[model samples]
Target: DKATIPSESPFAAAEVADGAIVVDIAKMKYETPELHVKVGDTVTWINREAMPHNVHFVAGVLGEAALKGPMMKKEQAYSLTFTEAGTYDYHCTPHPFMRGKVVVE
Candidate 1:
């Protein structure tokens, strides 16, 4: 299945380099909500709240690109990189309102 893999955006190391683009999860929502990235850039989501969080891209919208993340507790995270140009809307499974947008060009 060249389409994609379950953990293409798998959990990442505890701390990424400083100043790297990041989407922080806090206050029951996505801090940036929308993040624009270059086609080859890799973006990482960081869960800073005590409550668990995750990201999901339904197959309906992303088709072969559909992605899902495992629940991340405090200080946890995941990373993603896209080779194609597209816009993907993702949210936490436990908190659907924790919405986020990723634009790759």
Candidate 2:
């Protein structure tokens, strides 16, 4: 019993480019809730209403996994790349106050 293949990295494309920093989820919120990146500078989350939207990360913050996003729908988008610095606290698994913050000095 030794067969578990799941590693295909021919390298994909399109996550979020060209001057990122466009967090615009819509109605539910997160349209620049609060950000101040620097460590690596790379944060994009676009869902533009219509429902579905996610980006949870608030348990120890950037260690147990380092970022998360799934339930996207509308435009669908998510990106993260903050090497490390401080303050993170993200949310919106379905509208948990739709909080957000990323102060990475």
Candidate 3:
């Protein structure tokens, strides 16, 4: 699903500029491997390299309906706004070795 984004998680980069923090997806890695944000803040992942990637939450690590994304092509982005307090561990689907987390407070 490189281009098919979920209906519940639409792509929107406009508003995130002010309230969200960014995580770069490049060199088969998340540049800022770990991040922190408030419950209501959004975390946007931007793909900087020319490969396809996606963020998949670790099952049971967070809510079943927690943060996720479609396979993102270069220059594309995916974002999720955390709504609860917890630690969310995720990874790039195509590159399982690439991992990251968002600690929501």
Question: Residues 1-105, candidate 3, lDDT per residue (tens digit)?
Answer: 111222344354343466557888888999998898887776788787789888888556555454456877777778776778787788877788998888888
Against the true structure, whose lDDT is highest? 1
| lDDT digits (tens) for residues 1-105 of candidate 1 | 112332444355456655556888889898988788786676777888888888888875556655667787788777766666778888888778778888877
Residue 3, candidate 2: Cα error in Å is 37
Candidate 2 per-residue C-alpha lDDT over 3-105 given as tens digits, one digit per residue, 9 for 90 to 100? 1112111111255578877678788888888888787777777787679877778545776553446677777676667776888888886678889887888
For residue 41, model 2's alpha carbon misses the true position, in angstroms, by 1.5
| Candidate 2 regions with alpha-carbon error over 4 angstroms | 1-18, 21-39, 63-81, 85-92, 95-105
* Cα lDDT for residue 97, candidate 2: 88
- What does each candidate score in C-alpha RMSD? 3.2, 14.4, 5.0
Please say which candidate is ahead in TM-score: 1 or 2: 1
Q: How much does candidate 1 score in TM-score?
A: 0.80
Alpha-carbon lDDT of model 3 = 0.71
Off by over 4 Å in 3: 1-16, 65-68
